[PDB]
Every structure is written in C-alpha cells, then in structure tokens.
Amino acid sequence: TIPHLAIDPFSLDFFDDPYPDQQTLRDAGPVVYLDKWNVYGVARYAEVHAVLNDPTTFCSSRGVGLSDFKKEKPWRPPSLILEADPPAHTRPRAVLSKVLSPATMKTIRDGFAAAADAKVDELLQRGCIDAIADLAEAYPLSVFPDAMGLKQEGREHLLPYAGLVFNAFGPPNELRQTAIERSAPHQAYVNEQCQRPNLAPGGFGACIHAFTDTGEITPDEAPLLVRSLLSAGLDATVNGIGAAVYCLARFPGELQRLRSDPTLARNAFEEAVRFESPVQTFFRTTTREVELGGAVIGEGEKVLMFLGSANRDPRRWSDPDLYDITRKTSGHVGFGSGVHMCVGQLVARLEGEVMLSALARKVAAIDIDGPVKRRFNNTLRGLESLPVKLTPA
Numbered sequence: 001t002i003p004h005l006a007i008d009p010f011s012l013d014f015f016d017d018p019y020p021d022q023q024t025l026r027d028a029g030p031v032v033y034l035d036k037w038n039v040y041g042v043a044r045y046a047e048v049h050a051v052l053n054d055p056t057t058f059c060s061s062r063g064v065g066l067s068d069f070k071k072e073k074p075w076r077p078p079s080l081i082l083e084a085d086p087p088a089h090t091r092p093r094a095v096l097s098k099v100l101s102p103a104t105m106k107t108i109r110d111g112f113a114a115a116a117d118a119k120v121d122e123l124l125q126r127g128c129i130d131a132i133a134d135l136a137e138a139y140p141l142s143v144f145p146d147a148m149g150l151k152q153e154g155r156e157h158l159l160p161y162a163g164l165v166f167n168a169f170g171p172p173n174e175l176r177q178t179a180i181e182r183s184a185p186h187q188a189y190v191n192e193q194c195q196r197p198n199l200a201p202g203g204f205g206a207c208i209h210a211f212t213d214t215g216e217i218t219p220d221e222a223p224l225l226v227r228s229l230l231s232a233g234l235d236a237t238v239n240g241i242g243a244a245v246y247c248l249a250r251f252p253g254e255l256q257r258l259r260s261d262p263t264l265a266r267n268a269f270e271e272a273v274r275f276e277s278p279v280q281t282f283f284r285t286t287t288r289e290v291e292l293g294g295a296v297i298g299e300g301e302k303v304l305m306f307l308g309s310a311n312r313d314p315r316r317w318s319d320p321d322l323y324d325i326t327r328k329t330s331g332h333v334g335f336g337s338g339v340h341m342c343v344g345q346l347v348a349r350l351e352g353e354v355m356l357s358a359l360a361r362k363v364a365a366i367d368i369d370g371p372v373k374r375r376f377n378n379t380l381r382g383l384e385s386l387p388v389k390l391t392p393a
C-alpha cells in the first residue's frame with residue numbers, strides 16, 4: 001500500500017531545507033505518491049538505484065522532467081542522449097564518451113589545473129570573495145567554454161540557458177514558467193553555437209561534428225549533441241564546486257585533512273557531490289505496469305527519483321549527514337547510475353579535483369564572512385552567494 005504525501009519537492013521551502021522532508025519521504029515507504037504533482041516518488045537508495053538501472057521499464061524517452069512527451073510538446077527538441085532510450089541512445093552516447101574520454105582529459109588537464117591554481121592565487125590576493133560568483137562560476141567559465149571551442153561573443157547566455165534547462169525539468173511552477181517565458185534569446189544563442197562553423201577546431205564541439213564522418217551520428221544530430229554539453233556542462237559543475245567549497249567552509253577538520261594530503265582532492269570532490277547532490281532529482285516514465293519495492297505502478301506514470309536523498313539514506317551510508325573526504329563514495333548516485341550515468345563525469349571530476357588541489361596547497365582556512373544566499377532551481381541545489389575569507393597557507 002502506497003502512502004500519499006502533500007510535500008512539494010519543488011517548493012522554495014523545500015529547497016531551503018530539504019533534509020527533514022527527504023527523511024519523511026524515505027521513511028513513509030519505499031514508494032510514495034506525491035499528490036501535489038500526481039507522480040510517484042522513490043527516496044531510498046535501493047529503489048533509486050534500482051529505477052536508474054531498469055531503463056526498459058523506467059524510460060527516459062518520454063522526458064526526464066515532469067512533462068510526458070507522449071502527452072505534451074517538449075519545450076525544446078528532445079535531447080538525443082538524455083531523453084532517449086537504447087538503442088537510439090547508444091551511438092550518440094558513444095560519441096560523447098569518446099569526445100569526453102580519458103584520452104581527451106590528457107589534452108586539457110594542464111590548462112585546467114593551471115587555471116585553478118591561478119584563480120586561487122588571485123582570490124588569495126583579494127582576501128574576501130564570493131565563492132559562487134568569484135570561484136564556483138568564475139573558474140568553470142574560464143576553462144569550459146574555451147574547451148568547447150565557443151566564440152567569445154554571447155557567452156553571457158550560457159548560465160541563463162542552463163538555469164532554464166534545469167528549471168524546465170521541474171513542474172509548471174513559477175520557477176519553470178518564468179524560465180521558459182522569453183527564453184528565446186538564450187535558445188537562439190545556444191542553437192547557433194551548436195552549428196559547425198561556430199566551433200573552434202580541436203574543441204569538444206568540433207570533435208562532436210568530426211564524428212559525423214564515422215557513421216555514429218549524422219550531421220543533423222551533431223548540433224543537438226553539442227547542445228547537450230552546453231546544457232549540462234557548466235551549471236552542474238558550478239554547483240558541484242560551490243558545494244565542495246561550502247563543505248570545506250563548514251567542516252574545517254576536513255579542510256585540514258585535505259591540506260595534509262592534497263591527493264585526497266578528487267575524493268573530497270566526489271564526497272561533495274554525494275553530500276550536496278547538486279543534481280537533486282530526475283524523472284522516469286513507466287513503459288509498463290511494474291511493481292517496485294513491494295508497490296505497484298501503472299503504465300505511463302512519472303516516477304521522481306530523489307538522488308540527493310538516496311545519497312543521504314542511512315540504510316546505505318554511515319553518518320550520511322557528515323562530510324568525510326576519505327569516505328568510500330563509490331555507489332553514490334549524484335552522477336546517476338547505469339546507461340545514462342553522467343557522460344561528462346571526467347570533465348566534472350577534473351575541474352573539481354584541480355580546484356580542490358589548489359585550495360589544499362594554497363589555503364589554510366575558509367571562513368564564511370557574510371550572508372549566505374541560496375539559489376533556487378527545480379533541479380539544481382546550490383548557493384547564490386557564499387561570502388568567505390580565504391587565509392593563505
């Protein structure tokens with residue numbers, strides 16, 4: 001039997017402090033019904049992991065937001081990777097895996113690390129900075145658009161466009177409808193940059209187009225795959241890095257452990273992804289009647305997965321509410337799991353690692369120094385402003 005809850009997981013009060021409500025969602029049962037939006041929800045680790053790894057029943061081709069593409073028109077042409085199922089998903093996924101491959105990371109690591117080192121030294125000269133605007137946003141903006149091969153003109157549209165994308169996965173609340181209304185200039189900029197002439201040879205975007213020669217994607221598929229990287233490739237990392245700084249500012253003991261062994265930087269970042277889960281939620285749509293955790297669900301139903309809750313589920317994690325940079329993080333679902341698991345995870349971890357490495361080697365303390373402000377988004381968890389004082393090592 002399935003409990004009905006009135007919790008709105010897309011309300012500002014929920015975003016402001018989701019953790020009590022997430023425990024209510026977990027402890028009510030393995031599967032809940034959210035009467036506010038007429039969707040099923042799973043918030044425990046086991047069921048979230050199971051849904052993610054059962055793509056033939058919990059599909060993505062009817063949308064991974066609230067909207068069902070079989071019932072409503074998508075606000076933009078469907079993503080060829082995020083909003084596709086196998087087999088259509090497979091070859092586009094392979095292209096992005098190769099574009100963002102381990103081999104590709106060799107070509108960008110030195111510049112990504114150099115930019116992170118320089119940014120931290122720059123911020124140490126200022127002393128008191130906003131870790132969002134001046135760090136979590138500034139650093140990805142300084143490396144990722146260039147790595148994409150984007151021209152300089154128009155980059156002001158990148159973060160607004162991503163904010164729209166992530167709000168649009170949500171329900172038709174004020175956040176979503178404000179985001180979609182008059183979004184055309186953002187869409188126009190992105191869609192134009194996805195065309196082959198506008199992408200610098202050697203960058204991620206041009207490499208996507210180069211794979212049209214192989215038969216893995218057609219030329220008309222390449223712009224939409226560039227669009228995927230321009231949708232996901234900046235804003236999630238902004239909130240991942242901001243999350244990591246927020247954790248280190250709140251857990252000084254863990255900053256000191258990181259200073260003691262900067263080779264913990266990569267796992268310190270992975271733990272931040274688990275702890276904050278910058279990508280909080282995604283939907284699936286059932287392709288058939290299915291039973292889940294003892295409960296039954298009909299065909300064509302939306303299922304909301306609480307990734308952040310799964311990453312704090314005490315059934316799976318010891319001390320889930322503690323930030324522990326030596327935690328064995330493998331198994332967390334902050335990057336997803338299964339056939340859709342973050343194809344950009346090597347870029348994300350690269351940025352996160354080298355920024356936390358720079359902090360580890362250069363900073364002695366991070367003290368919150370002014371009002372903290374949360375940024376509200378139907379899908380992304382993160383801060384709008386994080387004023388901190390950095391003390392040099």
Ligand code: HEM
Nearest residue numbers: 081082232233236237240279334335336340342343344348
């Ligand atoms: C901390 C940073 C990031 C987080 C937390 C994150 C989170 C996620 C999650 C949870 C999914 C699963 C989607 C699903 O199961 O429906 C995903 C997929 C995806 N991500 Fe990431 N992401 C991050 C960074 C990036 C970056 C840097 C890129 C590109 C450069 C990227 C591109 C993608 C793409 C294209 C997909 C779709 C993969 C597929 O459907 O096969 N993401 N991401």
Ligand SMILES: CCc1ccc(C(=O)O)cc1
Nearest residue numbers: 079082227228231232236
């Ligand atoms: C990081 C979540 C995300 C993944 C993929 C897309 C896309 O394909 O547009 C958009 C967002």
Ligand SMILES: [Cl-]
Nearest residue numbers: 076187190191
């Ligand atoms: Cl678009």
